[PDB]
Amino acid sequence: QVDDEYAATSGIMDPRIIVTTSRDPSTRLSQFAKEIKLLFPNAVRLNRGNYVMPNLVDACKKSGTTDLVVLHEHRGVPTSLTISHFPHGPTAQFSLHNVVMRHDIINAGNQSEVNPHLIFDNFTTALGKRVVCILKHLFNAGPKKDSERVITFANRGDFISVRQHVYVRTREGVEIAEVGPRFEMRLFELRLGTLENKDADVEWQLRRFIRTANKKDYL
Amino acid sequence: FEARQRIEEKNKESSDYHAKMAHIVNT
Amino acid sequence: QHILKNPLVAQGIVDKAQIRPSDVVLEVGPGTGNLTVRILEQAKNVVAVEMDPRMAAELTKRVRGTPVEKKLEIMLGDFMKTELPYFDICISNTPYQISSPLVFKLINQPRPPRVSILMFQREFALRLLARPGDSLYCRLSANVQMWANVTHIMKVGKNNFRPPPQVESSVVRLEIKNPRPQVDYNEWDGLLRIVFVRKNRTISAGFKSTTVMDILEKNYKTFLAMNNEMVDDTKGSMHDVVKEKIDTVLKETDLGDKRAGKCDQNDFLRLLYAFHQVGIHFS
RNA sequence: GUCGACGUACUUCAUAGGAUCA
RNA sequence: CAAAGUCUUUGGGUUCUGGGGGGAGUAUGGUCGCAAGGCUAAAGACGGAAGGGCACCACCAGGAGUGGAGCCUGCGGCUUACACGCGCGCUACACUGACGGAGCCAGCGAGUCUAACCUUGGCCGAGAGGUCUUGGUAAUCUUGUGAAACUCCGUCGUGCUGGGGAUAGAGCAUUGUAAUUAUUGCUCUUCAACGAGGAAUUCCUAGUAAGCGCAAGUCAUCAGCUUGCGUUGAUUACGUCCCUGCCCUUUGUACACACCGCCCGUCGCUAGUACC
């Protein structure tokens, strides 16, 4: 469902992105930020050096930006992620776990960065709806009739996993090739206040030392 | 895997027993 | 458009059909597949016939990723205008305005089915399952009880339906005789049309109308002209002869006095044979 | 025969109305 | 409602009927009922061309590098109740240096009631470490966190020395029940490699690369790490499409003024007609 964070702007305007990092990235973390940049369309990035975050985000807001992603790491490899939707939108704070690197494996073609095709798989609860709408409103509005860049979100077992695949409509079926990174993505908080607040309305926190969260998805 | 298979066993057994006590009474 | 909401009459309808693991179910008017998926478990191959491509699209969406995804064909269009493939039992919910076509289309199939579980309106089904002498023995019962055999299963009361309609429904097992018997169809139907016009007047009444004697005179002439035997002197037109002819049959076989809504099937056979023996045919 | 019409036995659906306060 | 009346609870005569209504259901040791069948057999699509924008996955210039050393550390061999393959960081490889003294500019927050936190001072002990107290339940006390690089002179001469401390041993505090498996902190002593690092190699266009310190570990990741906080602070590009790859059109199709005035090839759909 489209939300008050998106109702006036969902299909109205196509978005732009900004990719940045917490403080003094490692080189491989910068390379992974490069991958997540080149995966997204409308991709422009900027290194954060000695920046006060209220000043940084506030200055980025008058210049006009739809969303801001910023990363974290643990001794070279990244672990966390957050999205801040600018017009008082909700920041979402995730834990990302696994990765494959286009640098690492092979040069398997090109991330053509065309307005890609979107896949959101197996989301039922209203939190799944929140994640779907927040993430859908980051992709470009208007892929073509045959946009061959299929991005894939899968929501099995509370660990949403993303891949990119490129298909050609061959004689009896489509055929796909694996590109982009492959992920174990998992959220732990939603705050409707933008991260500049530090104290605003938290929508959602993952209960951790609750027994039943062994089993239950979505808190 | 253990905790799941326990949950489906427990649900089926409980529901079926309640269904038998729904199968007897308005006969 | 009504929806069988009750999730317990559905299973009973299915398992009374005695689906073998090598059957081809025709399943006419599947609806939203509340019923279908059970048949997919128990049959090798299902052929669902549908007219609403909205329902067809949703129904074929239901089976995706399911192991039974490849054992279901869908045929679109009007049911009474397709060519049904071979099918081996038939299970039907379809809205009731085709209840009388459907039955005869199944009876007149080439290689008909073996058993079919059909849902009907209560008074319609009680026409089908009415023995000679009941209040409801109609012409429909005499046809269908010649070529098939029809047995009640249950009552489906009207509050298992969304929205609740006004008429009660029945579930009926119909099972075609095999071989179909070797009386004609069109002679059987001609005779039943005549003698069942007024169900409780005696049989000789139905052979008094002047439309009917015109029809029989025309048929008798065309029969003689089929065998090329030229015609005698008639005091009115030819029906004169036919008149006493008819009376003579209704003297011998005694049936010219019994009332046609109390005469069972062998009596119609004896009457049919007696008119055939003296040169009368009904189509 | 998951058959019908009864005859017994039982189950269930329909309960809020005025007055003041927030 | 002139009967549906007969002054509060009831008698003028007499015939008949009811034992509880409406909508759905379920069961049955009960009563009456209710079939047919025994020979018959389907299987529009495809290749090419040109026209305009894009990229530290392109060009140009370099900055910082890693890959050298040493040490910690994330995925890969083999073992227990150790000879290893892919990667991330810090420290140095010395005179812009190294040690002795002088001067010094922050911000982020944190902190204790029936507990001892965060603290000030005086004290003594090289130090490590022990002394009682107020300040603070918070701008108040830390706290101006007097931070580090930084600046001056002093010492020293390129020396693998005084750069360098991996490496050990001993003593000291200091816990804790024990440190024992140098848990930690001081002190002394030991003084390795490292003489600038090939093949390759990533990131990068200004408060930027780079270098320095202070704070907190707030339900996920994190402890020789992470995330904040601030400090100092530059060079070259701010141009191009040559290659690489990406996007837009082939009716410019959209309305004066300045341009021109068929997308191309292959298999298609169908029509026609000479032919057998």
Short mmCIF file of N, CA, C and O (backbone and C1' of nucleotides) in Angstrom, two decimals, chain E residues 217-274:
data_model
loop_
_atom_site.label_atom_id
_atom_site.label_comp_id
_atom_site.label_asym_id
_atom_site.label_seq_id
_atom_site.Cartn_x
_atom_site.Cartn_y
_atom_site.Cartn_z
P G E 217 29.25 3.27 27.36
"O5'" G E 217 28.12 2.70 26.40
"C5'" G E 217 28.03 1.31 26.14
"C4'" G E 217 27.84 1.02 24.68
"C3'" G E 217 27.92 -0.46 24.32
"O3'" G E 217 27.06 -0.72 23.22
"C1'" G E 217 29.60 0.70 23.17
P U E 218 25.60 -1.34 23.47
"O5'" U E 218 24.69 -0.64 22.36
"C5'" U E 218 23.31 -0.95 22.24
"C4'" U E 218 22.49 -0.10 23.18
"C3'" U E 218 21.23 0.51 22.59
"O3'" U E 218 20.14 -0.38 22.59
"C1'" U E 218 22.43 2.17 23.76
P C E 219 19.60 -0.99 21.21
"O5'" C E 219 19.09 -2.42 21.65
"C5'" C E 219 19.84 -3.18 22.59
"C4'" C E 219 19.64 -4.66 22.41
"C3'" C E 219 19.61 -5.14 20.96
"O3'" C E 219 20.19 -6.43 20.90
"C1'" C E 219 17.55 -5.65 22.02
P A E 220 21.61 -6.61 20.20
"O5'" A E 220 21.25 -6.79 18.67
"C5'" A E 220 20.47 -7.90 18.24
"C4'" A E 220 20.70 -8.15 16.78
"C3'" A E 220 22.15 -8.12 16.36
"O3'" A E 220 22.79 -9.37 16.50
"C1'" A E 220 20.92 -6.66 14.99
P U E 221 24.37 -9.43 16.77
"O5'" U E 221 24.99 -8.82 15.45
"C5'" U E 221 25.68 -9.62 14.51
"C4'" U E 221 26.74 -8.81 13.84
"C3'" U E 221 27.95 -8.51 14.71
"O3'" U E 221 28.89 -9.56 14.66
"C1'" U E 221 27.19 -6.51 13.70
P C E 222 30.05 -9.66 15.76
"O5'" C E 222 31.12 -8.59 15.29
"C5'" C E 222 32.24 -8.30 16.10
"C4'" C E 222 32.45 -6.81 16.27
"C3'" C E 222 32.96 -6.36 17.63
"O3'" C E 222 34.36 -6.52 17.77
"C1'" C E 222 31.22 -4.92 16.87
P A E 223 34.99 -7.94 18.18
"O5'" A E 223 36.06 -7.59 19.31
"C5'" A E 223 37.30 -6.98 18.98
"C4'" A E 223 37.79 -6.10 20.11
"C3'" A E 223 38.07 -6.82 21.43
"O3'" A E 223 39.22 -6.32 22.14
"C1'" A E 223 36.31 -5.23 21.72
P G E 224 40.00 -4.93 21.83
"O5'" G E 224 40.79 -5.16 20.47
"C5'" G E 224 40.80 -4.14 19.47
"C4'" G E 224 42.09 -4.07 18.69
"C3'" G E 224 42.41 -5.28 17.82
"O3'" G E 224 43.15 -4.87 16.68
"C1'" G E 224 44.09 -5.00 19.45
P C E 225 42.54 -3.84 15.59
"O5'" C E 225 40.96 -4.03 15.64
"C5'" C E 225 40.12 -3.13 14.93
"C4'" C E 225 38.67 -3.53 14.98
"C3'" C E 225 37.69 -2.43 14.64
"O3'" C E 225 37.48 -2.28 13.25
"C1'" C E 225 37.00 -3.49 16.63
P U E 226 37.27 -0.82 12.63
"O5'" U E 226 35.73 -0.51 12.86
"C5'" U E 226 34.72 -1.45 12.53
"C4'" U E 226 33.45 -1.12 13.25
"C3'" U E 226 33.02 0.33 13.13
"O3'" U E 226 32.29 0.56 11.94
"C1'" U E 226 32.90 -0.36 15.40
P U E 227 32.49 1.91 11.11
"O5'" U E 227 31.54 2.94 11.85
"C5'" U E 227 30.17 2.64 12.05
"C4'" U E 227 29.58 3.49 13.14
"C3'" U E 227 29.90 4.97 13.06
"O3'" U E 227 29.03 5.64 12.16
"C1'" U E 227 30.20 4.20 15.29
P G E 228 29.37 7.12 11.65
"O5'" G E 228 28.86 8.06 12.82
"C5'" G E 228 29.58 9.21 13.17
"C4'" G E 228 29.26 9.65 14.57
"C3'" G E 228 29.95 10.93 15.02
"O3'" G E 228 29.29 12.10 14.61
"C1'" G E 228 30.34 9.27 16.62
P C E 229 30.05 13.17 13.69
"O5'" C E 229 30.80 14.09 14.74
"C5'" C E 229 30.17 14.45 15.96
"C4'" C E 229 31.19 14.60 17.05
"C3'" C E 229 32.28 15.62 16.79
"O3'" C E 229 31.88 16.94 17.09
"C1'" C E 229 33.23 13.61 17.60
P G E 230 31.52 17.99 15.92
"O5'" G E 230 32.66 17.77 14.83
"C5'" G E 230 33.54 18.83 14.48
"C4'" G E 230 34.69 18.90 15.45
"C3'" G E 230 36.05 19.24 14.86
"O3'" G E 230 36.26 20.62 14.60
"C1'" G E 230 36.28 17.35 16.21
P U E 231 37.22 21.06 13.39
"O5'" U E 231 38.67 20.61 13.86
"C5'" U E 231 39.31 21.24 14.96
"C4'" U E 231 40.74 20.81 15.03
"C3'" U E 231 41.54 21.07 13.77
"O3'" U E 231 41.95 22.41 13.62
"C1'" U E 231 41.93 18.87 14.48
P U E 232 41.80 23.10 12.19
"O5'" U E 232 43.17 22.75 11.46
"C5'" U E 232 44.39 22.81 12.18
"C4'" U E 232 45.43 21.93 11.54
"C3'" U E 232 45.52 22.05 10.03
"O3'" U E 232 46.23 23.19 9.59
"C1'" U E 232 45.47 19.78 10.63
P G E 233 45.62 24.09 8.41
"O5'" G E 233 45.69 23.13 7.14
"C5'" G E 233 46.93 22.63 6.68
"C4'" G E 233 46.76 21.46 5.75
"C3'" G E 233 45.90 21.72 4.54
"O3'" G E 233 46.54 22.45 3.52
"C1'" G E 233 45.24 19.69 5.51
P A E 234 45.69 23.54 2.71
"O5'" A E 234 44.85 22.64 1.70
"C5'" A E 234 45.21 22.56 0.33
"C4'" A E 234 46.45 21.73 0.10
"C3'" A E 234 46.70 21.31 -1.33
"O3'" A E 234 47.20 22.35 -2.15
"C1'" A E 234 47.03 19.46 0.06
P U E 235 46.51 22.62 -3.58
"O5'" U E 235 47.16 21.52 -4.53
"C5'" U E 235 48.56 21.50 -4.77
"C4'" U E 235 48.98 20.30 -5.57
"C3'" U E 235 48.38 20.16 -6.96
"O3'" U E 235 49.03 20.97 -7.92
"C1'" U E 235 48.29 18.07 -5.85
P U E 236 48.34 21.28 -9.34
"O5'" U E 236 48.51 19.92 -10.16
"C5'" U E 236 48.11 19.84 -11.52
"C4'" U E 236 47.35 18.57 -11.79
"C3'" U E 236 45.97 18.76 -12.41
"O3'" U E 236 46.03 18.96 -13.81
"C1'" U E 236 45.83 17.22 -10.63
P A E 237 44.91 19.83 -14.55
"O5'" A E 237 43.60 18.93 -14.45
"C5'" A E 237 43.50 17.70 -15.14
"C4'" A E 237 42.10 17.16 -15.08
"C3'" A E 237 40.99 18.18 -15.15
"O3'" A E 237 40.78 18.71 -16.44
"C1'" A E 237 40.48 16.58 -13.50
P C E 238 40.86 20.30 -16.66
"O5'" C E 238 39.56 20.85 -15.92
"C5'" C E 238 38.32 20.89 -16.60
"C4'" C E 238 37.22 20.31 -15.75
"C3'" C E 238 36.16 21.30 -15.30
"O3'" C E 238 35.12 21.44 -16.25
"C1'" C E 238 36.91 19.99 -13.46
P G E 239 35.19 22.58 -17.38
"O5'" G E 239 36.02 21.92 -18.57
"C5'" G E 239 35.53 20.81 -19.30
"C4'" G E 239 36.56 20.29 -20.27
"C3'" G E 239 36.16 19.08 -21.09
"O3'" G E 239 35.39 19.41 -22.23
"C1'" G E 239 38.28 18.71 -20.15
P U E 240 34.22 18.42 -22.73
"O5'" U E 240 34.98 17.29 -23.55
"C5'" U E 240 35.85 17.61 -24.63
"C4'" U E 240 36.65 16.40 -25.04
"C3'" U E 240 35.83 15.15 -25.32
"O3'" U E 240 35.30 15.13 -26.63
"C1'" U E 240 37.61 14.61 -23.86
P C E 241 33.80 14.62 -26.88
"O5'" C E 241 33.98 13.13 -27.40
"C5'" C E 241 35.09 12.78 -28.22
"C4'" C E 241 35.52 11.35 -28.00
"C3'" C E 241 34.58 10.29 -28.57
"O3'" C E 241 35.34 9.19 -29.05
"C1'" C E 241 34.78 9.99 -26.23
P C E 242 35.83 9.17 -30.58
"O5'" C E 242 37.42 9.19 -30.46
"C5'" C E 242 38.23 8.58 -31.45
"C4'" C E 242 39.14 7.54 -30.84
"C3'" C E 242 38.45 6.43 -30.07
"O3'" C E 242 37.94 5.40 -30.91
"C1'" C E 242 40.21 7.28 -28.77
P C E 243 36.53 4.72 -30.57
"O5'" C E 243 36.91 3.35 -29.85
"C5'" C E 243 38.08 2.63 -30.20
"C4'" C E 243 38.68 1.97 -28.99
"C3'" C E 243 37.75 1.04 -28.22
"O3'" C E 243 37.80 -0.27 -28.79
"C1'" C E 243 38.91 2.51 -26.72
P U E 244 37.19 -1.57 -28.07
"O5'" U E 244 35.91 -1.05 -27.29
"C5'" U E 244 35.12 -1.96 -26.56
"C4'" U E 244 35.30 -1.77 -25.07
"C3'" U E 244 34.02 -1.61 -24.27
"O3'" U E 244 33.43 -2.85 -23.92
"C1'" U E 244 35.56 0.10 -23.68
P G E 245 32.53 -3.67 -24.96
"O5'" G E 245 31.27 -4.12 -24.12
"C5'" G E 245 30.05 -3.40 -24.24
"C4'" G E 245 29.79 -2.58 -23.01
"C3'" G E 245 28.58 -1.67 -23.08
"O3'" G E 245 27.36 -2.36 -22.91
"C1'" G E 245 30.40 -0.47 -22.17
P C E 246 26.14 -2.06 -23.90
"O5'" C E 246 25.20 -1.11 -23.05
"C5'" C E 246 25.12 -1.27 -21.64
"C4'" C E 246 24.63 -0.02 -20.98
"C3'" C E 246 23.57 0.75 -21.76
"O3'" C E 246 22.28 0.19 -21.65
"C1'" C E 246 25.22 2.25 -21.01
P C E 247 21.34 0.15 -22.95
"O5'" C E 247 20.56 1.53 -22.91
"C5'" C E 247 19.91 1.98 -21.73
"C4'" C E 247 19.55 3.43 -21.82
"C3'" C E 247 18.86 3.86 -23.10
"O3'" C E 247 17.47 3.60 -23.10
"C1'" C E 247 20.63 5.34 -22.66
P C E 248 16.70 3.31 -24.49
"O5'" C E 248 16.59 4.74 -25.18
"C5'" C E 248 15.76 5.75 -24.63
"C4'" C E 248 15.84 7.02 -25.43
"C3'" C E 248 15.49 6.90 -26.91
"O3'" C E 248 14.10 6.92 -27.16
"C1'" C E 248 17.51 8.11 -26.68
P U E 249 13.50 6.18 -28.45
"O5'" U E 249 13.90 7.12 -29.68
"C5'" U E 249 12.91 7.81 -30.43
"C4'" U E 249 13.42 8.21 -31.78
"C3'" U E 249 13.29 7.18 -32.89
"O3'" U E 249 12.00 7.15 -33.48
"C1'" U E 249 15.47 8.07 -32.91
P U E 250 11.40 5.79 -34.09
"O5'" U E 250 11.95 5.76 -35.58
"C5'" U E 250 11.70 6.83 -36.48
"C4'" U E 250 12.73 6.86 -37.59
"C3'" U E 250 12.80 5.61 -38.46
"O3'" U E 250 11.84 5.62 -39.51
"C1'" U E 250 14.97 6.19 -37.75
P U E 251 10.58 4.63 -39.47
"O5'" U E 251 9.35 5.59 -39.81
"C5'" U E 251 9.18 6.81 -39.12
"C4'" U E 251 9.21 8.00 -40.05
"C3'" U E 251 9.92 9.23 -39.51
"O3'" U E 251 10.48 9.98 -40.58
"C1'" U E 251 7.64 9.74 -39.87
P G E 252 11.88 10.75 -40.40
"O5'" G E 252 11.72 11.55 -39.04
"C5'" G E 252 12.23 12.88 -38.89
"C4'" G E 252 12.47 13.24 -37.44
"C3'" G E 252 11.22 13.22 -36.57
"O3'" G E 252 11.50 12.66 -35.29
"C1'" G E 252 12.20 15.41 -36.56
P U E 253 10.45 11.63 -34.64
"O5'" U E 253 9.03 12.21 -35.09
"C5'" U E 253 7.82 11.82 -34.43
"C4'" U E 253 6.94 13.02 -34.19
"C3'" U E 253 5.43 12.75 -34.18
"O3'" U E 253 4.81 13.69 -33.29
"C1'" U E 253 5.94 14.29 -35.89
P A E 254 3.39 13.36 -32.60
"O5'" A E 254 2.79 14.81 -32.29
"C5'" A E 254 2.93 15.88 -33.21
"C4'" A E 254 3.41 17.14 -32.52
"C3'" A E 254 3.78 18.30 -33.43
"O3'" A E 254 2.67 19.07 -33.85
"C1'" A E 254 5.48 17.97 -31.82
P C E 255 2.56 19.57 -35.37
"O5'" C E 255 2.82 21.15 -35.30
"C5'" C E 255 2.80 21.93 -36.49
"C4'" C E 255 2.84 23.42 -36.23
"C3'" C E 255 4.14 23.97 -35.62
"O3'" C E 255 4.42 25.25 -36.18
"C1'" C E 255 2.31 24.57 -34.25
P A E 256 5.51 25.41 -37.34
"O5'" A E 256 5.09 26.75 -38.10
"C5'" A E 256 5.95 27.34 -39.07
"C4'" A E 256 5.80 28.84 -39.12
"C3'" A E 256 7.06 29.61 -39.48
"O3'" A E 256 7.28 29.68 -40.88
"C1'" A E 256 6.05 30.59 -37.58
P C E 257 8.69 29.25 -41.51
"O5'" C E 257 9.75 30.21 -40.82
"C5'" C E 257 9.82 31.59 -41.16
"C4'" C E 257 10.87 32.29 -40.33
"C3'" C E 257 12.25 31.66 -40.34
"O3'" C E 257 13.03 32.04 -41.46
"C1'" C E 257 11.61 32.14 -38.11
P A E 258 13.32 30.99 -42.65
"O5'" A E 258 14.72 30.34 -42.26
"C5'" A E 258 15.94 30.90 -42.71
"C4'" A E 258 17.13 30.19 -42.11
"C3'" A E 258 17.12 28.67 -42.24
"O3'" A E 258 17.63 28.23 -43.49
"C1'" A E 258 17.59 29.27 -40.00
P C E 259 16.93 27.02 -44.27
"O5'" C E 259 17.60 25.71 -43.65
"C5'" C E 259 18.95 25.36 -43.96
"C4'" C E 259 19.25 23.94 -43.55
"C3'" C E 259 18.43 22.86 -44.24
"O3'" C E 259 18.96 22.49 -45.51
"C1'" C E 259 18.49 22.45 -41.90
P C E 260 18.11 22.73 -46.86
"O5'" C E 260 17.67 21.26 -47.31
"C5'" C E 260 18.63 20.28 -47.67
"C4'" C E 260 18.49 19.04 -46.82
"C3'" C E 260 17.29 18.15 -47.12
"O3'" C E 260 17.54 17.22 -48.15
"C1'" C E 260 17.40 18.59 -44.79
P G E 261 16.59 17.16 -49.45
"O5'" G E 261 15.87 15.74 -49.37
"C5'" G E 261 15.91 14.95 -48.19
"C4'" G E 261 14.64 15.11 -47.38
"C3'" G E 261 13.41 14.39 -47.92
"O3'" G E 261 13.34 13.04 -47.49
"C1'" G E 261 12.87 16.64 -47.37
P C E 262 13.86 11.85 -48.43
"O5'" C E 262 12.98 10.59 -47.98
"C5'" C E 262 13.25 9.90 -46.77
"C4'" C E 262 12.23 8.81 -46.51
"C3'" C E 262 12.74 7.63 -45.69
"O3'" C E 262 11.65 7.07 -44.94
"C1'" C E 262 12.08 6.87 -47.82
P C E 263 11.59 7.21 -43.34
"O5'" C E 263 12.81 6.31 -42.82
"C5'" C E 263 12.83 4.91 -43.04
"C4'" C E 263 14.24 4.42 -43.26
"C3'" C E 263 14.40 3.03 -43.83
"O3'" C E 263 14.20 2.97 -45.23
"C1'" C E 263 15.92 3.34 -42.04
P C E 264 13.77 1.58 -45.93
"O5'" C E 264 15.13 0.75 -46.02
"C5'" C E 264 16.24 1.23 -46.77
"C4'" C E 264 17.48 0.42 -46.46
"C3'" C E 264 17.39 -1.06 -46.79
"O3'" C E 264 17.66 -1.32 -48.16
"C1'" C E 264 18.27 -0.78 -44.61
P G E 265 16.79 -2.40 -48.96
"O5'" G E 265 16.94 -3.73 -48.10
"C5'" G E 265 17.15 -4.98 -48.73
"C4'" G E 265 18.16 -5.81 -47.99
"C3'" G E 265 17.67 -7.17 -47.51
"O3'" G E 265 17.71 -8.16 -48.53
"C1'" G E 265 18.71 -6.06 -45.72
P U E 266 16.37 -8.97 -48.89
"O5'" U E 266 16.35 -10.16 -47.84
"C5'" U E 266 17.41 -11.10 -47.78
"C4'" U E 266 17.20 -12.09 -46.66
"C3'" U E 266 15.80 -12.68 -46.58
"O3'" U E 266 15.57 -13.74 -47.49
"C1'" U E 266 16.46 -11.95 -44.44
P C E 267 14.09 -13.97 -48.07
"O5'" C E 267 13.30 -14.67 -46.88
"C5'" C E 267 13.63 -15.99 -46.47
"C4'" C E 267 12.83 -16.42 -45.26
"C3'" C E 267 11.32 -16.29 -45.36
"O3'" C E 267 10.68 -17.28 -46.14
"C1'" C E 267 12.02 -15.40 -43.31
P G E 268 9.28 -16.91 -46.86
"O5'" G E 268 8.99 -15.41 -46.37
"C5'" G E 268 7.68 -14.99 -46.02
"C4'" G E 268 7.43 -15.12 -44.54
"C3'" G E 268 5.97 -15.12 -44.11
"O3'" G E 268 5.33 -16.37 -44.31
"C1'" G E 268 7.18 -13.67 -42.71
P C E 269 3.87 -16.42 -44.98
"O5'" C E 269 3.01 -15.41 -44.10
"C5'" C E 269 2.41 -15.83 -42.88
"C4'" C E 269 1.10 -15.12 -42.66
"C3'" C E 269 0.22 -14.99 -43.89
"O3'" C E 269 -0.56 -16.15 -44.13
"C1'" C E 269 0.41 -12.88 -42.85
P U E 270 -0.48 -16.90 -45.54
"O5'" U E 270 -1.63 -16.22 -46.40
"C5'" U E 270 -2.92 -15.99 -45.84
"C4'" U E 270 -3.53 -14.72 -46.38
"C3'" U E 270 -3.52 -14.59 -47.90
"O3'" U E 270 -4.60 -15.28 -48.51
"C1'" U E 270 -2.72 -12.59 -46.93
P A E 271 -4.44 -15.85 -50.00
"O5'" A E 271 -4.66 -14.58 -50.93
"C5'" A E 271 -5.84 -13.80 -50.84
"C4'" A E 271 -5.75 -12.57 -51.70
"C3'" A E 271 -5.31 -12.82 -53.13
"O3'" A E 271 -6.37 -13.26 -53.96
"C1'" A E 271 -4.03 -11.07 -52.24
P G E 272 -6.23 -14.62 -54.79
"O5'" G E 272 -6.27 -14.14 -56.31
"C5'" G E 272 -6.61 -12.79 -56.62
"C4'" G E 272 -5.58 -12.17 -57.52
"C3'" G E 272 -4.93 -13.11 -58.52
"O3'" G E 272 -5.75 -13.34 -59.65
"C1'" G E 272 -3.27 -11.80 -57.48
P U E 273 -6.34 -14.81 -59.93
"O5'" U E 273 -5.66 -15.22 -61.30
"C5'" U E 273 -5.23 -14.22 -62.21
"C4'" U E 273 -3.80 -14.44 -62.63
"C3'" U E 273 -3.40 -15.87 -62.91
"O3'" U E 273 -3.85 -16.34 -64.17
"C1'" U E 273 -1.73 -14.83 -61.61
P A E 274 -3.93 -17.92 -64.45
"O5'" A E 274 -2.53 -18.23 -65.14
"C5'" A E 274 -2.08 -17.46 -66.24
"C4'" A E 274 -0.76 -17.97 -66.75
"C3'" A E 274 -0.48 -19.43 -66.47
"O3'" A E 274 -1.15 -20.32 -67.34
"C1'" A E 274 1.43 -18.15 -65.95
#
